[PDB]
Amino acid sequence: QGLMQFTLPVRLCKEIELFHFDIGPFENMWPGIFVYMVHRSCGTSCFELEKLCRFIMSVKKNYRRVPYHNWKHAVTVAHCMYAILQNNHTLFTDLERKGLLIACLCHDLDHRGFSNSYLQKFDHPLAALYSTSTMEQHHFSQTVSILQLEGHNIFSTLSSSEYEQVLEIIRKAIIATDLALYFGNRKQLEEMYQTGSLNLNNQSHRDRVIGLMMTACDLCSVTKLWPVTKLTANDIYAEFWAEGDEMKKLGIQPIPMMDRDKKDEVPQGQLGFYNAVAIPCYTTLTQILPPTEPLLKACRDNLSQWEKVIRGEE
Numbered sequence: 001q002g003l004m005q006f007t008l009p010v011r012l013c014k015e016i017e018l019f020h021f022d023i024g025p026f027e028n029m030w031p032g033i034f035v036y037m038v039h040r041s042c043g044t045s046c047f048e049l050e051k052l053c054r055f056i057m058s059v060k061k062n063y064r065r066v067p068y069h070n071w072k073h074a075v076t077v078a079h080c081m082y083a084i085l086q087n088n089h090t091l092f093t094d095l096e097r098k099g100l101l102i103a104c105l106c107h108d109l110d111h112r113g114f115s116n117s118y119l120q121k122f123d124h125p126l127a128a129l130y131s132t133s134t135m136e137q138h139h140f141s142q143t144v145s146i147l148q149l150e151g152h153n154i155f156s157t158l159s160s161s162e163y164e165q166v167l168e169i170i171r172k173a174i175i176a177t178d179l180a181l182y183f184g185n186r187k188q189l190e191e192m193y194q195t196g197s198l199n200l201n202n203q204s205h206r207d208r209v210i211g212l213m214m215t216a217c218d219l220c221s222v223t224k225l226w227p228v229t230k231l232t233a234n235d236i237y238a239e240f241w242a243e244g245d246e247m248k249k250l251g252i253q254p255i256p257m258m259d260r261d262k263k264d265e266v267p268q269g270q271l272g273f274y275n276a277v278a279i280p281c282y283t284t285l286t287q288i289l290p291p292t293e294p295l296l297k298a299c300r301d302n303l304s305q306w307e308k309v310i311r312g313e314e
């Protein structure tokens with residue numbers, strides 16, 4: 001370091017502060033974008049540049065060449081967390097700022113493009129090792145593995161205490177990306193916010209709020225400009241339909257979402273997801289953290305674009 005400030009071209013320098021930023025098609029700039037975000041979000045001092053770079057490149061190596069759950073998704077989810085943190089400066093601890101961008105970059109490590117359900121019906125060894133949140137316990141495991149490589153300990157300055165705290169933020173943040181867990185997490189938050197029992201000084205409450213941030217960042221393709229949203233959906237479904245094919249190979253009719261013979265039902269499927277998942281997620285998030293409102297507004301814009309697709313207005 002340490003008078004070595006990363007800088008981006010002007011258009012990226014400005015637009016990276018906005019929730020709807022797309023990191024672009026130049027894979028070799030993504031490490032640079034992430035370090036930029038860590039530097040501005042956390043400090044130039046929070047991590048040793050040499051170690052941070054080495055960690056980022058091993059994380060990248062451990063993402064697979066799958067249509068959707070890839071390195072670009074990792075960096076996209078970390079950019080949404082960066083926009084949330086930078087719009088809510090004073091609400092987060094020094095440990096939280098450190099751990100959350102790392103959690104986001106690692107949250108789908110070694111994803112194979114298959115759901116927890118498929119692993120369970122295939123009888124994959126991971127499903128025997130981890131009975132719930134199967135892929136998410138795997139992703140956390142891969143994170144600890146990489147932190148334990150020589151020259152990869154980006155947390156080397158933390159005390160024993162702070163190190164266990166930061167790895168516990170990361171574990172909880174990554175487990176929360178299991179959408180099966182989102183529904184009750186958001187119900188509890190909605191009740192806590194409305195009865196006014198929500199207390200950010202309660203560690204158990206902070207946990208829930210970071211859980212919700214993790215779902216928000218993870219689903220953030222629905223908060224992009226329509227052409228980004230529309231073209232990402234193609235990647236999402238290319239994984240869904242492969243999984244559907246693999247279900248049929250086990251002798252199991254897949255759900256329609258995964259059946260490539262039911263492509264026609266995609267736009268109605270997106271409506272259900274926006275209504276049952278996305279809109280509620282950003283709504284409750286915007287109640288807890290008012291400056292995240294642009295994510296809700298962009299989500300509602302994309303809902304209305306999918307209504308236009310159904311009405312043949314596109």
Ligand SMILES: COc1ccccc1N1CCN(C(=O)c2cc3c(C)nn(-c4ccccc4)c3s2)CC1
Nearest residue numbers: 179180181183218219220221222236257269270273
């Ligand atoms: C009744 O639903 C449930 C009830 C209890 C537990 C689990 C569920 N499932 C909910 C659905 N599940 C999904 O993975 C997802 C389905 C879709 C669809 C359609 N578009 N996107 C998506 C993602 C990211 C961006 C844009 C669009 C997603 S992600 C799995 C779990």
Ligand SMILES: [Mg+2]
Nearest residue numbers: 107108135177
């Ligand atoms: Mg995941």
Ligand SMILES: [Zn+2]
Nearest residue numbers: 107108177218
């Ligand atoms: Zn993800």
